[PDB]
Amino acid sequence: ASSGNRLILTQELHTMLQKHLFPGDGKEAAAILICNRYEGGRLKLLAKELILVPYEECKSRTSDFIAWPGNYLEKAIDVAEEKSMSIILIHSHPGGFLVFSDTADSSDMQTMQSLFQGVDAIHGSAIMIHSGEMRARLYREGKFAENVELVTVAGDDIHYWWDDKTEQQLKPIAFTSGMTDTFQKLTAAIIGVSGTGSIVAEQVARLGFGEILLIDHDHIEKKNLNRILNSTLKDALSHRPKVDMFAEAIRCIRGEDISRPINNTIFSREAVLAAANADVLFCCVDTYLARMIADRIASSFLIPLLDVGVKIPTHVDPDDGRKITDVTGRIDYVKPGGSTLSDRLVYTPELIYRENLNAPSVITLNMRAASACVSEFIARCFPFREYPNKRFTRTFFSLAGVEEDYIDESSITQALNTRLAVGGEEPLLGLPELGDK
Amino acid sequence: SGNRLILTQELHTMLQKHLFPGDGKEAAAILICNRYEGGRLKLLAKELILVPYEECKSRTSDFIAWPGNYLEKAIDVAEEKSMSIILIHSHPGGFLVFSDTADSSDMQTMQSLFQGVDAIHGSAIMIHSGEMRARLYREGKFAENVELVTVAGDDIHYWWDDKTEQQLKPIAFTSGMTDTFQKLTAAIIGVSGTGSIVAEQVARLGFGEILLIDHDHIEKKNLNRILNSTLKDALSHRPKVDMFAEAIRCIRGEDISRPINNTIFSREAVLAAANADVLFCCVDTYLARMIADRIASSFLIPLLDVGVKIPTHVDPDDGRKITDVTGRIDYVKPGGSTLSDRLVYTPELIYRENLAPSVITLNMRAASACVSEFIARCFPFREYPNKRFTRTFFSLAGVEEDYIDESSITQALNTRLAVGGEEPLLGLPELGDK
Numbered sequence: 021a022s023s024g025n026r027l028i029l030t031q032e033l034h035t036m037l038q039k040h041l042f043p044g045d046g047k048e049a050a051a052i053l054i055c056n057r058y059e060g061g062r063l064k065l066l067a068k069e070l071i072l073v074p075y076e077e078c079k080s081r082t083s084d085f086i087a088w089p090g091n092y093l094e095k096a097i098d099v100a101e102e103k104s105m106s107i108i109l110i111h112s113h114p115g116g117f118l119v120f121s122d123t124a125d126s127s128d129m130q131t132m133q134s135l136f137q138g139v140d141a142i143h144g145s146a147i148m149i150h151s152g153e154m155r156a157r158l159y160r161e162g163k164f165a166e167n168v169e170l171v172t173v174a175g176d177d178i179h180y181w182w183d184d185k186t187e188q189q190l191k192p193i194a195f196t197s198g199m200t201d202t203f204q205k206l207t208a209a210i211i212g213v214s215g216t217g218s219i220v221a222e223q224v225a226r227l228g229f230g231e232i233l234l235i236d237h238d239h240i241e242k243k244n245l246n247r248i249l250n251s252t253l254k255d256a257l258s259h260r261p262k263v264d265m266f267a268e269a270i271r272c273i274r275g276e277d278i279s280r281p282i283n284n285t286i287f288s289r290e291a292v293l294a295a296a297n298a299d300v301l302f303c304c305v306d307t308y309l310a311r312m313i314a315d316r317i318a319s320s321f322l323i324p325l326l327d328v329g330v331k332i333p334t335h336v337d338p339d340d341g342r343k344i345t346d347v348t349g350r351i352d353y354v355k356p357g358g359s360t361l362s363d364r365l366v367y368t369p370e371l372i373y374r375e376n377l378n379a380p381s382v383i384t385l386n387m388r389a390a391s392a393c394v395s396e397f398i399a400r401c402f403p404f405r406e407y408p409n410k411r412f413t414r415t416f417f418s419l420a421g422v423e424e425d426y427i428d429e430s431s432i433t434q435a436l437n438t439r440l441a442v443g444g445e446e447p448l449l450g451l452p453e454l455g456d457k
Numbered sequence: 458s459g460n461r462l463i464l465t466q467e468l469h470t471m472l473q474k475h476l477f478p479g480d481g482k483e484a485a486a487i488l489i490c491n492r493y494e495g496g497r498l499k500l501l502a503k504e505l506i507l508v509p510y511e512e513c514k515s516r517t518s519d520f521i522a523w524p525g526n527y528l529e530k531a532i533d534v535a536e537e538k539s540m541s542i543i544l545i546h547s548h549p550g551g552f553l554v555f556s557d558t559a560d561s562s563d564m565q566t567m568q569s570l571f572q573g574v575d576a577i578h579g580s581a582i583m584i585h586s587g588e589m590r591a592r593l594y595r596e597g598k599f600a601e602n603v604e605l606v607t608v609a610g611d612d613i614h615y616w617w618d619d620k621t622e623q624q625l626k627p628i629a630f631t632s633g634m635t636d637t638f639q640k641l642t643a644a645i646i647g648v649s650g651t652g653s654i655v656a657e658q659v660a661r662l663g664f665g666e667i668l669l670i671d672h673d674h675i676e677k678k679n680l681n682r683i684l685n686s687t688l689k690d691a692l693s694h695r696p697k698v699d700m701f702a703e704a705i706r707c708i709r710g711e712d713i714s715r716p717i718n719n720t721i722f723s724r725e726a727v728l729a730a731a732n733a734d735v736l737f738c739c740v741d742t743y744l745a746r747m748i749a750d751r752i753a754s755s756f757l758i759p760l761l762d763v764g765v766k767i768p769t770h771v772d773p774d775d776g777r778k779i780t781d782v783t784g785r786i787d788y789v790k791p792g793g794s795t796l797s798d799r800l801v802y803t804p805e806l807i808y809r810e811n812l813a814p815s816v817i818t819l820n821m822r823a824a825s826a827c828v829s830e831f832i833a834r835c836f837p838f839r840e841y842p843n844k845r846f847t848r849t850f851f852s853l854a855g856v857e858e859d860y861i862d863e864s865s866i867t868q869a870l871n872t873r874l875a876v877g878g879e880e881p882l883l884g885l886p887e888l889g890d891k
């Protein structure tokens with residue numbers, strides 16, 4: 021679950037690619053995906069640019085073959101040369117093809133060697149079927165090496181196309197052992213082992229996730245024994261780090277070294293580069309800085325993001341004295357290429373600036389929010405609602421007003437997303453404080 | 458081991474009205490109570506005798522002389538089952554009992570009560586706002602104060618003997634909430650997918666004693682749901698109550714959890730749960746919910762019942778599908794509508810019972826709302842009366858949530874109210890003392 025490689029496409033790229041590869045005439049088509057890479061605990065290919073080969077530019081197109089010109093390999097190499105990007109050829113299901121110049125044709129093998137000669141990097145060849153599922157093979161030194169373990173698109177719904185898929189195996193439904201089998205192959209990152217984060221982490225561990233990253237610098241103490249799952253008085257009296265405490269708890273619960281404690285703030289190279297390995301991010305730190313870092317990790321490394329927060333404002337009523345003003349929670353799902361936490365004003369530059377220049381809490385509210393947060397991931401991997409998951413991109417609930425509201429992704433304005441799929445380009449996350457010094 | 462005097466909301470409303478008619482003069486009443494003598498003494502208000510003003514010789518702002526034939530009538534009511542008799546007077550509380558021939562002071566009257574019925578008796582005072590304080594008398598002589606007088610209505614009221622006058626009621630989610638919980642006992646029926654989450658919250662909210670009732674064990678198949686369970690617990694088939702009680706001991710650094718390794722349908726479980734100040738029912742069986750129902754009414758304990766369901770169906774095209782994903786939270790106050798009234802169970806369903814996946818996210822969603830409900834009723838923080846939220850139904854598949862007011866629920870006659878441990882226990886001969 022930790023070292024399997026991945027090819028990640030954005031929903032918007034995948035939709036364009038699927039339309040191009042399946043126009044409706046049942047004939048093969050061709051396209052080229054240019055990808056950045058993350059190479060930490062695993063190889064992750066990050067789809068960045070898409071070149072569609074126009075049908076009229078192809079010498080021929082049939083139900084099981086296509087011939088397209090080699091100038092398109094040159095166009096892909098032009099895009100990839102500077103940053104040694106990975107180049108993935110993609111064809112409609114059957115996948116037979118050749119690349120022709122004026123003088124010579126190149127087989128699939130010859131074309132992959134040609135790609136390597138133009139750009140020293142891992143390249144690949146991928147196939148898509150009409151439904152959109154994708155399989156991919158990687159070429160090292162221009163030669164066939166290994167299949168991609170997982171091709172994934174995290175859109176409104178989240179799709180996992182595994183290399184070991186069974187032919188007559190239907191997708192599992194939510195809350196079943198087939199859900200567990202999926203999660204067992206995935207890595208989850210919990211940013212903040214907090215009131216909400218310890219609960220998200222607990223659910224993630226017991227749901228069967230295969231690797232669980234825990235990122236937090238804080239420690240157990242008497243004041244948070246009312247909230248932090250698995251914490252003990254002995255932990256508090258020694259100020260045991262939260263990540264070490266919870267990592268030990270997970271190893272006892274699951275009986276295996278699946279927890280990865282990161283004793284640091286998310287605003288660190290250690291944390292960012294660990295988190296980049298994850299297949300899903302849960303942000304549970306109640307600071308504007310933390311949510312922005314989580315936001316930028318999600319976009320840069322194409323990781324779906326679930327951000328959760330709760331608030332209990334209070335005020336002094338002239339008659340009764342102090343009063344609970346409201347009891348609220350918020351869940352935000354962010355897909356790569358969809359609206360960001362910034363777009364949603366979960367943070368702003370001014371709020372982060374004022375935060376870095378310079379309130380009751382309760383387990384019941386934390387659990388109410390954390391349960392909804394992990395349920396949102398389940399619903400998007402294994403749809404079970406009567407409405408499209410897109411309708412529930414944002415969730416706002418109030419236990420005092422006893423109301424719950426949902427915001428559709430389509431209602432949210434999107435700014436230009438410059439960091440999408442840039443991976444670990446320095447300065448990391450565009451922040452000099454995280455850059456290689 | 459802190460004693461308690463528990464009144465139903467209906468009896469307290471009636472008592473408050475009688476003691477404060479609006480003329481500012483004292484009034485007198487007599488509460489006849491059954492008892493539960495377990496870890497703590499619990500006085501269960503059963504009958505209330507209101508002394509008519511017109512039959513009182515004198516009623517003033519700080520004194521009342523009322524006839525003693527009512528003391529004799531209360532003794533008659535209490536004689537058969539040696540019920541406890543609590544005299545109640547309006548705030549100031551000065552009084553005398555007069556016959557046709559003699560007057561008796563408060564001390565003499567308390568001694569007369571003990572001569573008429575060999576049992577614990579008491580004398581109580583209510584202020585206009587409804588708060589109550591009480592003193593118990595043993596062998597007709599002053600003994601100890603009542604640590605807690607409580608009424609679990611739509612709002613739950615705790616009137617502590619150690620109350621400070623300038624001190625204000627705490628608000629939800631504060632240390633003053635913890636201070637209240639530290640004095641209370643909570644019983645969790647079922648350390649289940651929901652029950653382990655309820656118990657976890659109850660422990661970390663600071664409850665003083667936590668009773669855990671369950672006969673089931675940790676297994677590999679429930680390591681995906683039972684909080685604090687470990688692979689070692691599954692290997693050793695560890696009783697859920699023992700597992701969680703040990704967890705609580707380490708979490709709190711204090712042995713505050715009592716493991717009852719048995720089914721709720723047992724004398725051991727019923728008699729243990731009767732000590733609790735609040736019942737959380739988290740067993741998904743009709744029998745368990747009926748037993749919890751009858752404990753709540755018999756021993757005047759507020760009850761929170763929680764259940765979740767994930768129906769599935771086979772769609773012709775897609776195959777197996779999730780039909781719905783639902784949760785239910787029911788708050789039951791003593792003398793309010795019961796789980797039976799709400800059709801949470803029926804006699805037919807229990808008979809057939811003793812003749813659908815699950816997931817931690819749904820369990821946690823329901824268990825969190827369940828415990829939040831108790832907090833809201835002890836420390837109101839909502840923008841509408843708590844009565845509006847007597848029942849909660851939510852669907853995560855339809856993405857809807859609905860709330861049912863107590864006033865929408867028709868009630869049957871409630872005959873077990875405050876009967877305590879009258880045999881056969883809970884009216885079930887299978888739970889009687891052979």
Ligand code: NA
Nearest residue numbers: 357358434437
């Ligand atoms: Na976008």
Ligand code: NA
Nearest residue numbers: 792793868871
């Ligand atoms: Na009733």
